[PDB]
Coordinates of C-alpha atoms and ligand atoms in Angstrom, one line a residue:
Chain A
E1 CA 109.3 102.1 112.8
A2 CA 111.0 100.4 116.1
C3 CA 110.4 96.7 114.6
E4 CA 113.3 95.7 111.6
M5 CA 111.3 93.2 110.3
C6 CA 108.2 94.6 110.1
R7 CA 110.6 97.5 108.2
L8 CA 111.7 94.8 105.9
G9 CA 108.4 93.4 105.5
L10 CA 109.7 89.5 106.4
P11 CA 107.1 87.5 108.3
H12 CA 107.7 87.3 112.2
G13 CA 105.6 87.1 115.2
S14 CA 103.1 84.4 116.9
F15 CA 100.9 84.0 114.0
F16 CA 104.0 83.0 111.5
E17 CA 105.4 80.7 114.3
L18 CA 101.8 79.3 114.5
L19 CA 101.7 78.6 111.3
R20 CA 105.2 76.6 111.1
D21 CA 104.2 74.8 113.9
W22 CA 100.8 73.6 112.7
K23 CA 102.4 72.9 109.4
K24 CA 105.0 71.0 111.1
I25 CA 102.1 68.5 112.4
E26 CA 100.5 68.3 109.3
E27 CA 103.7 67.4 107.6
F28 CA 104.3 64.3 110.2
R29 CA 100.9 63.0 109.6
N30 CA 100.3 62.8 106.0
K31 CA 103.6 61.1 105.8
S32 CA 102.7 58.9 108.9
Chain B
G1 CA 97.0 99.1 106.4
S2 CA 93.4 99.4 107.8
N3 CA 91.9 97.6 105.1
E4 CA 93.9 94.4 106.0
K5 CA 93.8 95.0 109.3
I6 CA 90.0 94.4 108.8
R7 CA 90.2 91.4 106.1
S8 CA 92.6 89.6 109.1
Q9 CA 90.3 90.3 111.9
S10 CA 87.6 88.6 109.5
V11 CA 90.1 85.4 108.6
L12 CA 90.5 85.6 112.4
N13 CA 86.6 85.2 113.5
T14 CA 86.2 82.6 110.5
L15 CA 89.1 80.5 112.2
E16 CA 87.2 81.0 115.5
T17 CA 84.5 79.8 114.1
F18 CA 86.0 76.4 113.1
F19 CA 88.5 76.1 115.8
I20 CA 86.3 76.7 118.9
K21 CA 84.9 73.0 120.0
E22 CA 82.2 71.6 122.4
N23 CA 85.1 68.7 122.3
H24 CA 88.1 68.9 120.9
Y25 CA 89.5 70.3 117.5
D26 CA 90.9 68.2 114.7
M27 CA 91.4 68.9 111.2
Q28 CA 88.9 67.2 109.2
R29 CA 89.4 66.7 105.4
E30 CA 86.8 69.0 104.4
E31 CA 88.3 72.2 106.2
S32 CA 92.0 71.4 105.5
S33 CA 92.2 73.9 102.9
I34 CA 90.6 76.6 104.2
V35 CA 92.1 76.6 107.7
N36 CA 95.7 76.5 106.0
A37 CA 94.5 79.4 103.9
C38 CA 93.5 81.4 106.9
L39 CA 96.6 80.4 108.9
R40 CA 99.1 81.2 106.4
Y41 CA 97.0 84.5 105.6
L42 CA 97.5 85.4 109.4
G43 CA 101.0 84.4 109.5
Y44 CA 102.0 86.9 106.6
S45 CA 99.6 89.3 107.6
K46 CA 101.5 92.7 108.8
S47 CA 98.9 94.0 110.8
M48 CA 99.0 90.7 112.9
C49 CA 103.0 90.6 113.5
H50 CA 102.6 92.4 116.9
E51 CA 98.9 91.5 118.0
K52 CA 98.1 89.2 120.8
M53 CA 96.9 85.8 119.8
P54 CA 93.5 85.4 120.9
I55 CA 93.1 82.0 123.6
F56 CA 91.2 79.8 121.2
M57 CA 94.2 79.6 119.1
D58 CA 96.4 78.4 121.5
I59 CA 93.5 75.9 122.7
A60 CA 92.8 74.7 119.1
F61 CA 96.8 74.1 118.8
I62 CA 97.3 72.3 122.1
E63 CA 94.3 69.8 121.0
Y64 CA 95.6 69.6 118.0
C65 CA 99.4 69.2 118.5
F66 CA 98.9 66.7 121.0
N67 CA 95.6 65.2 119.2
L68 CA 93.4 65.3 122.4
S69 CA 90.3 63.1 122.9
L70 CA 87.8 62.8 125.6
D71 CA 85.4 59.9 124.8
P72 CA 86.9 57.0 122.9
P73 CA 94.2 55.3 120.5
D74 CA 95.6 56.3 117.2
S75 CA 99.6 55.0 116.6
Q76 CA 101.8 58.3 117.1
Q77 CA 100.3 61.2 116.2
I78 CA 102.3 63.5 118.5
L79 CA 105.5 65.2 116.7
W80 CA 108.2 64.8 119.5
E81 CA 110.3 67.4 118.3
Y82 CA 112.3 69.7 120.6
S83 CA 111.2 73.5 118.8
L84 CA 108.0 72.4 118.3
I85 CA 107.2 70.8 122.2
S86 CA 109.0 73.9 123.5
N87 CA 106.3 76.3 121.4
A88 CA 103.9 73.9 122.6
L89 CA 104.6 74.2 126.2
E90 CA 104.7 78.2 125.5
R91 CA 101.1 78.2 124.3
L92 CA 99.5 75.9 127.4
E93 CA 101.6 78.5 129.6
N94 CA 99.5 81.3 127.8
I95 CA 96.5 79.6 128.4
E96 CA 97.0 79.0 131.9
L97 CA 98.1 82.8 132.4
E98 CA 94.8 83.7 130.5
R99 CA 92.8 81.5 133.0
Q100 CA 94.8 82.5 136.3
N101 CA 94.4 86.3 135.1
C102 CA 90.8 86.1 134.1
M103 CA 89.9 83.9 137.4
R104 CA 90.9 86.9 139.7
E105 CA 88.3 89.5 138.3
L106 CA 78.8 80.4 141.3
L107 CA 79.8 78.3 144.5
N108 CA 82.2 75.8 142.1
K109 CA 84.6 78.9 141.6
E110 CA 87.4 77.9 143.8
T111 CA 87.3 74.0 143.2
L112 CA 87.4 74.6 139.5
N113 CA 90.4 77.0 139.7
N114 CA 92.3 74.5 142.3
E115 CA 91.5 71.7 139.8
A116 CA 93.0 73.5 136.7
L117 CA 96.0 74.3 138.7
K118 CA 96.7 70.7 139.4
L119 CA 95.8 69.6 135.8
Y120 CA 98.1 72.5 134.4
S121 CA 101.3 70.9 136.7
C122 CA 100.8 67.3 135.7
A123 CA 100.3 68.1 132.1
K124 CA 103.2 70.5 131.8
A125 CA 105.4 67.8 133.4
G126 CA 103.9 64.8 131.4
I127 CA 105.0 66.6 128.2
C128 CA 108.2 67.3 129.6
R129 CA 108.8 63.6 130.4
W130 CA 107.8 62.2 127.2
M131 CA 110.0 65.1 125.3
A132 CA 112.5 63.9 127.6
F133 CA 112.0 60.5 126.7
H134 CA 112.2 61.0 122.7
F135 CA 115.6 63.3 123.8
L136 CA 117.3 60.0 125.6
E137 CA 116.2 57.3 122.6
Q138 CA 118.3 59.6 120.1
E139 CA 121.6 58.0 119.1
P140 CA 123.9 60.1 119.7
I141 CA 121.9 62.6 121.9
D142 CA 121.3 66.2 121.3
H143 CA 123.1 67.1 124.8
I144 CA 122.9 71.0 123.9
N145 CA 119.0 71.0 122.8
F146 CA 118.3 68.6 125.6
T147 CA 119.5 70.6 128.7
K148 CA 118.5 73.7 127.2
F149 CA 114.8 71.9 127.2
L150 CA 115.3 71.0 130.8
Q151 CA 116.2 74.4 131.8
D152 CA 113.4 76.0 130.3
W153 CA 110.5 73.7 131.4
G154 CA 112.3 71.6 134.5
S155 CA 112.8 74.1 137.2
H156 CA 109.7 73.0 138.9
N157 CA 110.9 69.7 138.7
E158 CA 114.4 70.1 139.2
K159 CA 114.8 66.8 141.3
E160 CA 113.4 64.1 138.9
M161 CA 115.8 66.4 135.8
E162 CA 119.1 65.8 137.7
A163 CA 118.2 62.1 137.0
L164 CA 117.6 62.2 133.2
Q165 CA 121.1 64.3 132.9
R166 CA 123.1 61.2 134.6
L167 CA 121.0 58.9 132.5
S168 CA 122.0 60.8 129.3
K169 CA 125.3 59.7 129.7
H170 CA 124.8 56.2 130.0
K171 CA 124.6 53.9 126.7
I172 CA 121.8 53.4 124.5
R173 CA 120.4 49.9 125.9
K174 CA 120.2 51.5 129.7
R175 CA 118.3 54.5 128.3
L176 CA 116.0 52.1 126.4
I177 CA 115.1 49.9 129.4
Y178 CA 114.5 53.2 131.5
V179 CA 111.9 54.7 129.0
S180 CA 110.4 51.4 128.3
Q181 CA 109.8 51.0 131.8
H182 CA 108.7 54.2 133.0
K183 CA 106.1 54.6 129.7
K184 CA 104.7 51.1 131.1
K185 CA 104.1 52.4 134.5
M186 CA 102.4 56.1 133.3
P187 CA 101.5 55.8 129.6
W188 CA 100.7 58.4 127.1
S189 CA 96.9 58.0 127.6
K190 CA 97.2 59.2 131.2
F191 CA 98.7 62.4 129.9
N192 CA 95.9 62.5 127.4
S193 CA 93.5 62.6 129.8
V194 CA 94.9 65.3 132.0
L195 CA 95.5 67.6 129.0
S196 CA 91.8 67.1 127.8
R197 CA 90.5 68.1 131.3
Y198 CA 93.3 70.9 131.8
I199 CA 91.8 72.2 128.3
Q200 CA 88.2 71.3 129.2
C201 CA 88.1 72.8 132.6
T202 CA 89.6 75.9 131.5
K203 CA 87.1 76.5 128.6
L204 CA 84.3 76.0 131.3
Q205 CA 85.8 78.2 133.8
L206 CA 86.6 80.8 130.8
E207 CA 82.8 80.7 129.8
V208 CA 81.1 80.6 133.3
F209 CA 83.3 83.4 135.0
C210 CA 85.4 85.2 132.5
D211 CA 82.9 85.8 129.5
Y212 CA 84.0 83.7 126.8
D213 CA 82.2 81.3 124.4
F214 CA 83.7 78.0 124.5
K215 CA 80.5 76.2 123.7
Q216 CA 80.2 74.7 126.8
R217 CA 76.1 75.4 127.6
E218 CA 76.0 71.5 128.0
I219 CA 78.1 71.3 130.7
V220 CA 76.7 74.3 132.3
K221 CA 73.0 73.0 131.9
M222 CA 74.1 70.0 133.6
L223 CA 76.2 72.0 136.7
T224 CA 72.5 73.4 137.3
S225 CA 70.1 70.5 137.2
Chain C
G1 CA 73.8 71.1 110.5
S2 CA 73.5 74.6 111.3
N3 CA 77.4 74.7 112.6
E4 CA 77.9 74.1 109.1
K5 CA 75.6 77.0 108.7
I6 CA 77.2 79.3 111.1
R7 CA 80.8 78.4 109.6
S8 CA 79.8 78.8 106.0
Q9 CA 78.1 82.0 106.9
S10 CA 81.4 83.6 108.2
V11 CA 83.1 82.2 105.4
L12 CA 81.1 84.4 103.3
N13 CA 81.4 87.6 105.6
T14 CA 85.1 87.3 105.1
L15 CA 84.7 87.4 101.7
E16 CA 82.8 90.3 101.9
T17 CA 86.0 91.9 103.3
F18 CA 88.2 90.7 100.6
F19 CA 85.6 91.5 97.6
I20 CA 83.6 94.8 98.5
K21 CA 86.5 97.4 96.9
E22 CA 86.2 101.3 96.4
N23 CA 87.0 101.0 92.9
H24 CA 86.9 97.0 91.6
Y25 CA 88.0 93.8 92.8
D26 CA 91.0 91.6 91.5
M27 CA 93.0 88.8 92.9
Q28 CA 96.3 90.2 94.1
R29 CA 98.4 87.1 94.5
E30 CA 98.6 87.5 98.5
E31 CA 95.1 86.6 98.5
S32 CA 94.5 84.3 95.7
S33 CA 94.6 80.8 98.0
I34 CA 92.2 82.0 100.9
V35 CA 89.9 83.7 98.5
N36 CA 89.8 80.2 96.3
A37 CA 89.9 78.4 99.7
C38 CA 86.6 80.3 100.8
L39 CA 84.8 79.9 97.7
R40 CA 85.7 76.3 97.2
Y41 CA 84.1 75.7 100.7
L42 CA 81.1 77.7 99.9
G43 CA 80.6 75.9 96.6
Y44 CA 80.7 72.2 98.4
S45 CA 78.5 73.4 101.4
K46 CA 75.2 71.2 101.6
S47 CA 74.0 74.6 103.9
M48 CA 74.5 77.1 100.8
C49 CA 72.6 75.2 98.1
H50 CA 69.4 76.8 97.9
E51 CA 70.6 80.3 99.7
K52 CA 70.3 83.8 98.3
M53 CA 73.5 84.6 97.2
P54 CA 74.4 88.3 98.3
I55 CA 75.0 90.9 95.4
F56 CA 78.5 91.7 96.2
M57 CA 79.2 88.2 94.9
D58 CA 77.9 88.9 91.3
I59 CA 79.6 92.4 91.7
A60 CA 82.9 90.9 92.2
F61 CA 82.5 88.2 89.7
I62 CA 81.6 90.5 86.8
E63 CA 84.9 92.8 88.0
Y64 CA 86.9 89.8 87.9
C65 CA 85.3 88.1 84.5
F66 CA 85.7 91.5 82.6
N67 CA 89.3 92.5 84.4
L68 CA 88.0 96.2 85.3
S69 CA 90.6 97.1 87.4
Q70 CA 93.4 88.9 75.8
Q71 CA 92.3 88.6 79.7
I72 CA 88.8 87.6 79.1
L73 CA 87.6 84.1 78.5
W74 CA 85.2 84.2 75.6
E75 CA 83.2 81.0 76.2
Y76 CA 79.4 80.5 75.6
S77 CA 78.6 78.8 79.3
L78 CA 80.7 81.4 81.3
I79 CA 79.7 84.7 79.3
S80 CA 76.3 83.6 79.9
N81 CA 76.5 83.2 83.3
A82 CA 78.2 86.3 83.4
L83 CA 75.2 88.1 81.6
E84 CA 72.8 86.5 83.9
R85 CA 74.8 87.8 86.9
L86 CA 74.7 91.2 85.7
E87 CA 70.8 90.8 85.5
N88 CA 70.9 89.9 89.1
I89 CA 73.0 92.9 89.8
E90 CA 70.1 95.3 87.6
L91 CA 67.4 93.5 89.1
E92 CA 68.7 94.2 92.7
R93 CA 69.4 97.6 91.9
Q94 CA 66.0 98.4 90.0
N95 CA 64.1 96.7 93.3
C96 CA 66.2 98.5 95.6
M97 CA 65.8 102.0 93.7
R98 CA 62.0 101.7 93.5
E99 CA 61.6 101.8 97.3
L100 CA 66.9 115.0 91.4
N101 CA 70.5 113.0 91.6
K102 CA 68.4 110.0 92.4
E103 CA 66.7 110.2 89.1
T104 CA 69.7 111.1 87.1
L105 CA 71.9 108.4 88.9
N106 CA 68.8 105.8 87.9
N107 CA 68.6 106.8 84.1
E108 CA 72.7 106.6 84.2
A109 CA 72.4 103.3 85.3
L110 CA 70.0 102.1 82.6
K111 CA 71.8 103.5 79.8
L112 CA 75.0 102.3 80.8
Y113 CA 73.5 98.8 81.2
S114 CA 71.7 98.2 78.3
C115 CA 74.9 99.3 76.5
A116 CA 77.5 97.3 78.5
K117 CA 75.0 94.2 78.1
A118 CA 75.2 94.9 74.3
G119 CA 78.7 95.0 74.3
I120 CA 79.4 92.2 76.0
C121 CA 76.8 89.9 73.5
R122 CA 78.5 91.7 70.8
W123 CA 82.2 90.5 71.7
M124 CA 80.6 86.9 72.7
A125 CA 79.3 87.0 69.3
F126 CA 82.3 88.3 67.4
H127 CA 84.3 85.2 69.3
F128 CA 81.6 82.7 67.6
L129 CA 82.3 84.2 64.3
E130 CA 86.1 83.8 64.3
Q131 CA 85.9 79.9 65.1
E132 CA 86.0 77.2 62.6
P133 CA 84.0 75.4 62.0
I134 CA 81.0 77.7 63.8
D135 CA 78.6 76.4 66.0
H136 CA 75.6 77.5 64.6
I137 CA 73.2 76.2 67.4
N138 CA 74.9 77.5 70.0
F139 CA 75.7 80.9 68.2
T140 CA 71.9 81.4 67.4
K141 CA 70.8 80.0 70.7
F142 CA 73.2 82.7 72.5
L143 CA 71.7 85.4 70.2
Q144 CA 67.9 84.9 70.9
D145 CA 68.7 84.6 74.9
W146 CA 70.5 87.8 75.3
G147 CA 70.8 90.3 72.1
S148 CA 66.8 90.4 71.9
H149 CA 66.9 94.3 72.2
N150 CA 69.7 95.0 69.3
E151 CA 67.8 92.8 66.9
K152 CA 69.3 93.9 63.8
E153 CA 72.9 93.9 64.8
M154 CA 72.1 90.5 65.5
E155 CA 70.2 90.0 62.2
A156 CA 73.5 91.5 60.9
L157 CA 75.8 88.9 62.9
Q158 CA 73.5 85.9 61.8
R159 CA 73.5 86.5 58.0
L160 CA 77.6 87.3 58.4
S161 CA 77.7 83.7 59.7
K162 CA 76.9 82.3 56.1
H163 CA 80.2 83.8 55.0
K164 CA 83.8 81.6 55.3
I165 CA 86.5 82.5 57.7
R166 CA 88.2 85.1 55.7
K167 CA 85.1 87.5 55.0
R168 CA 84.1 87.0 58.8
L169 CA 87.6 87.9 60.3
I170 CA 87.7 91.0 57.9
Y171 CA 83.9 92.2 59.4
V172 CA 84.9 91.3 62.8
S173 CA 88.4 93.0 62.7
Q174 CA 87.3 96.0 61.1
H175 CA 84.3 96.3 63.9
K176 CA 86.4 95.5 66.4
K177 CA 88.6 98.3 65.4
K178 CA 85.5 100.9 65.0
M179 CA 84.4 100.6 68.8
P180 CA 87.3 99.0 70.7
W181 CA 86.6 96.9 73.8
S182 CA 88.2 99.8 76.0
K183 CA 85.0 101.6 75.3
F184 CA 82.8 98.9 77.1
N185 CA 85.4 98.2 79.5
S186 CA 84.7 101.9 80.5
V187 CA 81.1 101.7 80.0
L188 CA 81.1 98.0 82.4
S189 CA 82.9 100.0 84.7
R190 CA 81.0 102.9 85.2
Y191 CA 77.9 100.8 85.6
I192 CA 79.3 99.4 88.3
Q193 CA 80.4 102.3 90.2
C194 CA 77.2 104.1 89.5
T195 CA 75.1 100.8 91.0
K196 CA 77.6 100.9 94.2
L197 CA 77.0 104.3 94.3
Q198 CA 73.4 104.1 94.1
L199 CA 73.1 101.5 96.5
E200 CA 75.1 102.9 99.6
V201 CA 73.6 106.3 99.2
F202 CA 69.8 105.3 99.0
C203 CA 69.4 101.4 99.6
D204 CA 71.7 101.4 102.5
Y205 CA 74.3 98.9 101.5
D206 CA 77.9 99.5 102.3
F207 CA 80.5 99.4 99.4
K208 CA 83.0 102.0 100.6
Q209 CA 81.6 104.6 98.6
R210 CA 81.8 107.2 101.8
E211 CA 84.6 109.1 100.3
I212 CA 83.2 109.4 96.8
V213 CA 80.0 110.8 98.3
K214 CA 82.2 113.5 100.2
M215 CA 84.0 114.2 96.9
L216 CA 80.7 115.2 94.7
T217 CA 79.5 116.9 97.8
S218 CA 82.9 119.0 97.1
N219 CA 81.9 120.7 93.8
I220 CA 84.3 119.4 91.4
Chain D
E1 CA 64.5 65.0 100.6
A2 CA 62.7 67.0 97.8
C3 CA 66.0 68.4 96.1
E4 CA 67.5 65.0 94.7
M5 CA 70.8 66.5 94.3
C6 CA 71.0 66.8 98.4
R7 CA 69.9 63.5 98.8
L8 CA 72.7 62.4 96.5
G9 CA 75.3 64.9 98.4
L10 CA 76.5 66.5 95.0
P11 CA 77.3 70.0 94.6
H12 CA 74.8 72.3 93.3
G13 CA 73.6 76.0 93.5
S14 CA 74.7 79.6 93.0
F15 CA 77.8 79.1 95.4
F16 CA 78.5 76.3 93.1
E17 CA 78.4 77.6 89.9
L18 CA 80.1 80.6 90.6
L19 CA 82.9 78.3 92.0
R20 CA 83.1 76.9 88.7
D21 CA 83.1 79.8 86.7
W22 CA 85.4 81.5 89.0
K23 CA 87.9 78.2 88.2
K24 CA 87.3 78.7 84.1
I25 CA 88.8 82.1 84.3
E26 CA 91.7 81.3 86.5
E27 CA 93.0 78.4 84.3
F28 CA 92.5 80.7 81.6
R29 CA 94.6 83.8 82.8
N30 CA 97.2 81.2 84.5
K31 CA 98.9 80.3 81.3
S32 CA 98.1 83.3 79.5
Ligands
ZN1 ZN1 107.5 93.6 113.6
ZN2 ZN1 69.6 71.0 96.7

C-alpha cells in the first residue's frame, strides 16, 4: 500500500517504460 | 495475485528465449506480434511494476535501439529523441553496474574487465555526442531539455560540454557546419562498433565468470583452443 | 532449426500457465492478445507441425469452445474438430487410468463422457435441422461419424429431416425446451473437472486440483 | 522431405488447426 500507482491500478515502472520506448522505435522504423 | 506473478514470470522466460542472441537481437517479422504482446503484457502486469528488470532485457533493448551489427549500413534507424536516448543511457548504465557488480564476485578476467570499462565510457560519450548533434540541428533549439541532457549525461566530459552550450547560441548554419565536420571525422559506424563490442564483451564476462548464459559458447571455445 | 524448437517450446510453456485453471479457462480481455499471439506462433511454427499436442490444449479448447466458465458456434467442421479433441481427452484419460474412489471417478467420467458427447452431437443436429435448405450430405456425414451410439435418436432426426421448415422448428423447439443446453453445459463441465481431478491425483499431471483434493478429504 | 506441406513451407498440423478453430470462435463472439 505504499505505492499510489499500484493502489489506483495504473501502469508504471521499468517494464512499462521499456514498452513505451520499444513502441517509439517500432513506430519510427515503420514510417521510415 | 500469485497466479499472474507466475504468468508474468513465464512471459519473461519466453522473452529470454527470443532476446538472448549469440550476435545481436533484431525484430524479425515473424516474431513482431509475440514479442510486442509479451512486452505489453509485462508493461501492464501489476506484479512486475516494482520487479528489477533482468539484464538481458536491457541488452536486447540496447541492441534494438541502436540497431547494433557486428559483421556487415541501414539509413537512419536510430531515433534520436531526448526522452528515448536518456532512457537508453540509463539502461546502458544498468548493464555496466550489473557487469561491475558481478565481476567483483581464467587469466583473461582483468583484461576483459578493463576493456569493458573503456568501451562503456566511449559508447556513453558517443551516444551523448550524437544526441547533442540532434539537439544542435533543431530549429529552434530546445535549450531546457538540451541543458538538462548534458547535466545528466555529460558530467564526466564537462570540458567538451562547455563548447556545445556556447555553440547552441550561434545560428543554424554554424551549428550545421560544426555537426557536419564532426560527423565526417568520427562517423556513427565507429560507435556502432564500440557499442557492439561493449555488449559482446559484457555478455562474455557475464557468461564465463558470473553464471549467465548469453550464447557465447563458441567465443569461449575459441578462447580455450 | 532447433532454436525455433526452444522458442516454440517456451511459447507452449507460457500457454500452459495461461490455460491450466482450477475451474474453466476463458479469454479475459487482458490476455487475448498474448494468447492469440502464442497460438498463432505455434500454429505457424515449422517445428510444431508433427508434434504431439499436450492435453491441456484440448481441454482449454473444449472449455473455450463450449463457454464452460448464443455463444457456441454450431458449425459442422468446428464441432466435428471439437468432438475429436474431446475424444483425444478421453483416450488420454483411459490410458493414464489403465496404469475404491479410483473406480468411482473412472466410471463417472465414462458416463459424463457419453452423455456430453450425445449432447454435442444432438445440438449440432438440431442446428442442421434449423437451416433452409438443409445440407443432407453433411448432416448425414456428421451423424454417421459421431452419433453411432445413440442410433435410434439419430434415425428419428434423419426422418424428421424430410419435413419442411415449420415442423422441423416445432420438434427442435419442443426438444430444446424438454432438455435445455444448461443440462449438457453442466455435464460437460463436470466431465472436464472429473478428468482433471483423475489425472492429477493418479497419473501425475498438474491441473491445480490440490485445493479440490483437500476439500474432498475434509468430508463435506 | 517426406511431408510435402513441410517442403512447401505451408502451415499444417494440430497447432495450426487449433489456431483456425480458435479464431472461428473469436470471430463469432466479437460481433455477438
Ligand atoms: Zn507501484
Ligand atoms: Zn509437415
